[PDB]
Write a protein that binds this DNA or RNA. Sequence first.
RNA 1: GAUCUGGUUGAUUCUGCCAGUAGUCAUAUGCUUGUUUCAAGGACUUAGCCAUGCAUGCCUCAGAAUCACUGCAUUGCAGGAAUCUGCGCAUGGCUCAUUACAUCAGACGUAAUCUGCCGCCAAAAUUUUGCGGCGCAUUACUGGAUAACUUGGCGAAACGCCAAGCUAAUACAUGAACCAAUCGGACGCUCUCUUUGAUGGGACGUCCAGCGAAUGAAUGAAAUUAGAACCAACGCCUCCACCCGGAGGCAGUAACACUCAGACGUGUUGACUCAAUUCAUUCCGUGCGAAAGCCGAGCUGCUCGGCGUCUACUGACGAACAACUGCCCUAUCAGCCAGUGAUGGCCGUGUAGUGGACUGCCAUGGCGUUGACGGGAGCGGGGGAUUAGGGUUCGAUUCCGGAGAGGGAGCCUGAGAAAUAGCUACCACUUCUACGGAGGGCAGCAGGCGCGCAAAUUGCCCAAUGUCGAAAAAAUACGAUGAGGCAGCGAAAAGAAAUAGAGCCGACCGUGUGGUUGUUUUCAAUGGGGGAUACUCAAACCCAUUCAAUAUCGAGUAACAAUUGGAGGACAAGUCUGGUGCCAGCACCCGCGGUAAUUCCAGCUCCAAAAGCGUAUAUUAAUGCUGUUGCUGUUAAAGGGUUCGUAGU
RNA 2: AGAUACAAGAAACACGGGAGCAGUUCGCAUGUCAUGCAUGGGGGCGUCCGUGAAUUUACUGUGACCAAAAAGAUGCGACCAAAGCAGUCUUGCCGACUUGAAUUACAAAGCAUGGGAUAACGAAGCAUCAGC
RNA 3: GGAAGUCGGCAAAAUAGAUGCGUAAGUUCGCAAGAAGCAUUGGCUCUGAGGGCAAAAAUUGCCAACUCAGAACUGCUUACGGCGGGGAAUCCAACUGUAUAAUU
Lengths: 187, 72, 262
Amino acid sequence: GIVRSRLHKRKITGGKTKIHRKRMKAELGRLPANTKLGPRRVSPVRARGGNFKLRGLRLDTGNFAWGTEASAQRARILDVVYNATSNELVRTKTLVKNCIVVVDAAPFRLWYAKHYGIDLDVKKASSKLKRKWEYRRKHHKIEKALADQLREGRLLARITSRPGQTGRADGALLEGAELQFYLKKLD
Amino acid sequence: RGVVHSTKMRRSIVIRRNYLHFIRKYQRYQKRHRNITVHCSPCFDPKPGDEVVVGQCRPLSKTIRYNVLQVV
Amino acid sequence: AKKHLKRLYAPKDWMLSKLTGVFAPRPRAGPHKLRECLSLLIIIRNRLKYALNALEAQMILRQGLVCVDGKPRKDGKYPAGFMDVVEIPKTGDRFRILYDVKGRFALVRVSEAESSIKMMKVVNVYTGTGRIPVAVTHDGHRIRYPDPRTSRGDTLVYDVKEKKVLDLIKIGNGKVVMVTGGANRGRIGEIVSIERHPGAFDIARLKDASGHEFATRATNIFVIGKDMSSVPVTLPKQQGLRINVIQEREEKLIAAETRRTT
RNA sequence: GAUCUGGUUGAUUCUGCCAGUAGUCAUAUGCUUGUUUCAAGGACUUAGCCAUGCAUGCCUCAGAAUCACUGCAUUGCAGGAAUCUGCGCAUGGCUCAUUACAUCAGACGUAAUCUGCCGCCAAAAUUUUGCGGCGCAUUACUGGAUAACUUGGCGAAACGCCAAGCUAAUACAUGAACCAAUCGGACGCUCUCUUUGAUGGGACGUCCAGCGAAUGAAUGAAAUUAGAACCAACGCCUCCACCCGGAGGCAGUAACACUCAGACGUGUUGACUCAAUUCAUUCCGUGCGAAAGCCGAGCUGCUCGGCGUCUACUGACGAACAACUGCCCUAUCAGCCAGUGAUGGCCGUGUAGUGGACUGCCAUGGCGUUGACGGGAGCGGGGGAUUAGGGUUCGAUUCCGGAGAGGGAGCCUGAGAAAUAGCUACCACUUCUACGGAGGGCAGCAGGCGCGCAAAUUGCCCAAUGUCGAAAAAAUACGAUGAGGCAGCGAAAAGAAAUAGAGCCGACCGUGUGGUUGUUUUCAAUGGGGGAUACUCAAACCCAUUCAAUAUCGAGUAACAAUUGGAGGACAAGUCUGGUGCCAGCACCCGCGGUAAUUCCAGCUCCAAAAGCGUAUAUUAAUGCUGUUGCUGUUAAAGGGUUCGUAGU
RNA sequence: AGAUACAAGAAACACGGGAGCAGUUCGCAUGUCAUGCAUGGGGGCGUCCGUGAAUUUACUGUGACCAAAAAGAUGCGACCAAAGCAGUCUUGCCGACUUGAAUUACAAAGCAUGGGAUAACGAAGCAUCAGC
RNA sequence: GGAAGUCGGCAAAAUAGAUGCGUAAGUUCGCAAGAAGCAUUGGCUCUGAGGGCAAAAAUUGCCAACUCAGAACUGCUUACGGCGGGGAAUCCAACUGUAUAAUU
Ligand SMILES: [K+]
Ligand SMILES: [K+]
Ligand SMILES: [K+]
Ligand SMILES: [K+]
Ligand SMILES: [K+]
Ligand SMILES: [K+]
Ligand SMILES: [K+]
Ligand SMILES: [Mg+2]
Ligand SMILES: [Mg+2]
Ligand SMILES: [Mg+2]
Ligand SMILES: [Mg+2]
Ligand SMILES: [Mg+2]
Ligand SMILES: [Mg+2]
Ligand SMILES: [Mg+2]
Ligand SMILES: [Mg+2]
Ligand SMILES: [Mg+2]
Ligand SMILES: [Mg+2]
Ligand SMILES: [Mg+2]
Ligand SMILES: [Mg+2]
Ligand SMILES: [Mg+2]
Ligand SMILES: [Mg+2]
Ligand SMILES: [Mg+2]
Ligand SMILES: [Mg+2]
Ligand SMILES: [Mg+2]
Ligand SMILES: [Mg+2]
Ligand SMILES: [Mg+2]
Ligand SMILES: [Mg+2]
Ligand SMILES: [Mg+2]
Ligand SMILES: [Mg+2]
Ligand SMILES: [Mg+2]
Ligand SMILES: [Mg+2]
Ligand SMILES: [Mg+2]
Ligand SMILES: [Mg+2]
Ligand SMILES: [Mg+2]
Ligand SMILES: [Mg+2]
Ligand SMILES: [Mg+2]
Ligand SMILES: [Mg+2]
Ligand SMILES: [Mg+2]
Ligand SMILES: [Mg+2]
Ligand SMILES: [Mg+2]
Ligand SMILES: [Mg+2]
Ligand SMILES: [Mg+2]
Ligand SMILES: [Mg+2]
Ligand SMILES: [Mg+2]
Ligand SMILES: [Mg+2]
Ligand SMILES: [Mg+2]
Ligand SMILES: [Mg+2]
Ligand SMILES: [Mg+2]
Ligand code: NA
Ligand code: NA
Ligand code: NA
Ligand code: NA
Ligand code: NA
Ligand code: NA
Ligand code: NA
Ligand code: NA
Ligand code: NA
C-alpha cells in the first residue's frame, strides 16, 4: 500500500532510479484520521511491536492549561477559528495540532473565584481562606485580554496534542504576544 | 571542513570539498571534488570563498545531514 | 532472527575443528556478548573432557551438577565469560574464566573461599523510579544501591553467595589493569596516563612489569587492584607478561630436548 | 627461467606480424586404464515444464482423560489413542533473474526508533466472601461456555461441511477488606489554645495522593569586587532571682514549628527539551491477578523446596534507517530535473521513529567535460589463475551481505513476514468430475521431459555435527529432521605408487679383465587376487593386521602380456624396405606428392612421457606487439597548414 | 627573583558539589533530647570565564582498530606425501602448571613523533604606524 | 453489414468552440502545423491574486472594474445557435493574381 521510502523519488542529478526488490512492511504508511469536532469516537490501530495507537474521530473536549497559573481544567471545545495550513481545514472544522479554538471559560471562572476570591458563593468562606485570598491577591496581576475574555465567556487556545495519534484533544490558552498576533488575524 | 560554494537558498548553503585520489598503477594523483548541502543558522553570515566547519546531525531534509558550527 | 552458527563463523578461541560437522552451538542471549563468551557445552565437552558427545553433556547439564554463578544452569547454550566461576560440586572442581597472555581463554583453579567473590566493571549509572541509583555491569548485573562515588569506568568486588558489594576500586593513575580486548588481551600493566579526546575513544597508556610500554582503547581495560599485591583474584601462570617470539621459540626447543635426555 | 625459435632477399642488415612453446580446482570430446588416499559434480542454454514418494514439529515428577482403550487389583494403581491449551514453523536448504549516489567493503552513527525467548532485578493502587437484614467475622471452597465423544447426517468428490446432546483448564470472564508502612496538595456553619481580627499554633473530618501513558508549570547548579547604615518580621543571646511587662544587641548558627535534633542541599553525558522528583487536569478498553495455577517432601490444621504466569525497567540476541571514501566499457550519448516534487523554507499529517515520505502556502533553486543524463555487460566481497618487479584476467558456486520462490499486485496473524510446502484476485500454463463443482506451483532431496558440446541413486541412517520443543538417560516407558552424515555413480582436479630381483653356463658385443646383449637354466621375494578367531561401521563397505598361536591358498611365455603421439626444420628420434605417382593424402607455419617421396599408405627399428596421452575453444605468460617502471613518430604506420587561446598539467 | 627570547599542552581570574578527609613541599577542645559511635614560599590535580596578530594538510617513523576459511610461517616421523592440529612417556587409578606461536591484507578514517621537499591560506607594502 | 453501389465515395454522413499536454518525413530554415493524438468542460456554496484617492506613513480610512487560478458538495437523457474530417503517394503550374457577360 502506502510507502514511506525514497525508492520512487528522483535522484539529485535528475536521473531515474531502477527499483529492484518489492515493498516491505517496515515502511508502510496509513490513511489520515481527519479528526472532526463532535461526540467522542475512537478507533484502535495495532502498531509495530504490539502496542495500540488511538485514532481520533470527532472529539469534543479535553484538558486546557492556564500556563501563567500552572493549572489546567477540563473544558468543552466550541469551534475552530484559524489554521496555518489552509482555510479549507477551518471550513471543514478539523482538529489538528496547533489549531486555534475557543473554549467555554466556565471552569476557569470557577477556579479563579475559589483561588483569588474575585468573581467575574464567594462571600460564604472561612476566615482563614479569606486571609489567604488577601495574600494571593497582594502581588498577582491579570492582563487586559485575559480578563476581558473571561468576562465575555470564551477564550482562545491552541491544540497541543496530536489528535490522530493519541485520541486526545489537549491544549493551552493563548497569552502574551501570541494572543495579540492571532487577535489581529481574526479581525 | 569545506569551502562555501553558493548561498542562494534560504538558511542553506552548498560547500565543496577538494581532495586528491591516488591511482596505484601510475603512482600518481588526480583531483576530485564533492558537493554537500548544509543548514546555516542566522548567527553565521558566510559568503562564497569562506571556510566553514560542519558537524553531522539527524536528517533535516531530503539531502541535508550537516549543520554549520563555525565560520573562519 | 538467526538461530544457527557455522563452524567457520564461530570464534577462533573455541578451537573447533573444521572437519567435524558444519555447525557449532550458538550462544543464547544472556550475561555476555556472542563474540566474547564461552558456552557451557564447549567447556564441559571440549575443555574438561567430562563428556564425549553433546548427548552426554546434556545428561550432565539437565541435572544441575554445574553452577556458573552459584546457581545451576540447565542450558548448554548459556554464554559464560570473563570473571565467571564454574563449579561442579560432585567432582569438587572450581574454575575461574580469565584471559591467557596470548588472548585465549584460561580456566584457573580457585579455592573454596575465593570461589565466592567476583569482580565486575561498571558500564553505566542511571536513576530508577523511586529515585534509586542503579549501576549496570559488564556481566549484566544491576546493583540497586552502589556507593555514591561509583563512576562509569571503575570496578567493584561482589559476593555471589550473599548478594552484597565488598568494596569499590576507582580508576586512576598507578593502578593495575587487565586488557580485555584487541591485540593486547590478557596483558597486565600499570596505568601511566589517559588521553581524553572528547567525542571519540579515550586512549590508555600502560607499562608492563618488565618496563615495556603499550597503549589501547580505554574501553578495553579492567581495573583489578591498586597494586599487584592487592589483587583479590588468582592470576594465570604467565602473570600477563608477554615475551619475545624469538626467545619463546628458543626456550620451547631447549625444553623437550632436555626432557629427551631424561 | 629476469631465456626464446621458423617464414619476406640471388645474398645482407631492419620494422612487423603470422606460426611454434608452458600453465589453468577450465570446459568438452577421442584412444587407453592393474592398486590405494583425497575430492568437484544440470551454474553457462531455458528464473524452461514437471508423474510419484519424502522434506517441521514438540510431554516432563511438575496445564486439561469416565476412550463405551490396555495391564495388574478389585469402587484402585500405572501406561495412556484422540482433542483443547502453550511454544516453534520469519531459521535451515535452493538459486543468481533483476541491480551503478542501488548492492557491497573498510570506517562511523541512531540524542531518530522497535525489540518475544535469555540475564540481573522490581512490585504496599483496588471493599472481596460468608451469615442476619446496613451490622457481625475461624472472610476466598467464584462463573458460564466449547472440543475430543454419540445421535442424526449432506455431498461424485474436495488438507469439503451442517444440527442436537454431554464434560475440563495454566482456554475465556469476573474478583479480593484488615494484617500493611512512610511521603504532601486542596478545603471546613467543627473544636482548643496564644496574641490584638492574625498568609497564628495544634487536633478533628472530607476529597485526592501506586507503575505506565497524554497536556501544561517548576527543578535538572556555580565558577569577572570589597566594606557599611536604616525598616518589616524571622532566628538567637543578655537583663530586671523566675512569672508579670519592658528593656538592648549580633557570640555562634546545613536545612526543617514535635515524636526522624543529617531519613539525598549533589543523575548522566563531549553535549540533551533525556533519567528522575513535585504540583494541576485526565485514561472507559485501546494496559497492570497473589494465574482463584501445578508437582515433591515433612510433620483435618501447618512447615519447607522445585516449577509456571500478568505488568514496569535495562543489558544481551536482533531489526529498521542514514551515508565519509572506493568499484568495468561507451560522446556516431552534452546538457539533466519542475503541470503531477524538481532544490530549499513555514505550520502540520503519517510512521516504531527522522525525512518532500506526504497535504497546503512561499522562493528559484539543485546537478554536469573532475563526464551528469542515456546505452552495453554484470549479484558485491573474502578470494582463484599466471608470479623477477610492475601488472593482466576470473569470482553462478562452501563463509559474510543482498534479492526471489511461474509473472506481477494486495494482505491477515504475529515480537518479527508485504511469508509463498500462508491467504486473496488477475494473466499464462495445467489436473479430477456423476458437468453441479473442486484443485496446482521441485530456483528443497531423489527422479522425469525438453534444451543443449556439457553434468550422478526415484539408496541407508539420525551413530556424529546442530535446530525446534511441554523435552536428560533409564525404568510398566525408544521425538522430528532428504539440515546433516554414510554408501552407489564419478580418468574435473590433487597425493603415494606395481608391471620384476640376484646368479651359473654357452655363444656374441667394444674398450682393452673389466662394462652387457642373447638362450637352456636355479632360487629366493612380493603383491594384484581367495579367505578369517576377527577389526571397522548405526548396519554394511573401504583401509589396516594375518596365511598358525596345537591347527590357514596361491606367479614363469611371472598370457597377471602398457598406452598415446611422433622420426625434413622449428623440435628429441632413420640419407632402412615395399606401395602410390600433383592422385590418394599429409601439413598449426615453412612445405611434401608427376617413377629413387628423409613428409602420404604400411613393415622393422628408434624418440618423448607414461597410467596416462592427443584434439577444439576461452584465458595468463611468452609480448618493451598497450610501454607508470618501459615503446615508436626524416625515409618502415605515425607531428596538427599557421598563430591566438580557456579548462588541465 | 624581574628583562631577552619560548611557551593558547600558555598566561591571568575563579569553583568544596574540585584531590576516596581541601593533594606535595620548604587527650584536650566543638556538639551532646544524637549510633556526635561525629569533627578538629612555591609547584603538580580536576572544572569553568576573559586573552592569538591562532596554524593546517601531503610525506615519513612508531603504535591503535581491523571474521574465519584461503595465502605466507613455528612445532609434531599420521610408514612418506597431498593433509591434520595434533600428540609424547618416566608404564601411568598419571604426568608434561601439555600444545595449538607469530604474520600480510589496498584506498579512506583515527593517536601521538619529525619538519627537509611540497601543497592550502593571507598580503600587494602611507588601506601604515597606538611605545612600557 | 459498411463502398459490395457507381466511369468515379457523386450525394449524404462525418470533424468542429476554448484550455492543458504533445506533434513525423521533407525543407529555400521562413515553414510543413490547427500536422497526427490524449484529457477537461454543467450547477451550487466558498477561497486567493491582480488597483486608485486621501491624510502627521511596510500605517489607517474610503472606493471602482472584471479577469485569472483553486476547493467542497451535487448532477447528466452527452441535450440551442455557430464552428476544420485526417493521412501516404504520382502528374502539371513556382507562388498572390487574370481570364471565354449566356455550356470550357
Ligand atoms: K517538519
Ligand atoms: K509469537
Ligand atoms: K541427530
Ligand atoms: K617408389
Ligand atoms: K613498436
Ligand atoms: K503534410
Ligand atoms: K490572396
Ligand atoms: Mg637469382
Ligand atoms: Mg508421565
Ligand atoms: Mg495450538
Ligand atoms: Mg535464509
Ligand atoms: Mg562492515
Ligand atoms: Mg491494598
Ligand atoms: Mg533532608
Ligand atoms: Mg544477470
Ligand atoms: Mg559470488
Ligand atoms: Mg547467469
Ligand atoms: Mg565448485
Ligand atoms: Mg549448484
Ligand atoms: Mg522473500
Ligand atoms: Mg520454474
Ligand atoms: Mg509472496
Ligand atoms: Mg516447493
Ligand atoms: Mg531436483
Ligand atoms: Mg526421557
Ligand atoms: Mg517419548
Ligand atoms: Mg543436502
Ligand atoms: Mg591418480
Ligand atoms: Mg598389466
Ligand atoms: Mg590381497
Ligand atoms: Mg613412416
Ligand atoms: Mg620428419
Ligand atoms: Mg634432431
Ligand atoms: Mg596445435
Ligand atoms: Mg621409398
Ligand atoms: Mg598476454
Ligand atoms: Mg617481459
Ligand atoms: Mg611514413
Ligand atoms: Mg609541420
Ligand atoms: Mg589456514
Ligand atoms: Mg466497386
Ligand atoms: Mg458492379
Ligand atoms: Mg461531396
Ligand atoms: Mg523534424
Ligand atoms: Mg488539435
Ligand atoms: Mg498557378
Ligand atoms: Mg489563385
Ligand atoms: Mg461561359
Ligand atoms: Na619486402
Ligand atoms: Na590392497
Ligand atoms: Na582392494
Ligand atoms: Na516472560
Ligand atoms: Na564479476
Ligand atoms: Na543471503
Ligand atoms: Na501463485
Ligand atoms: Na562432464
Ligand atoms: Na605485454
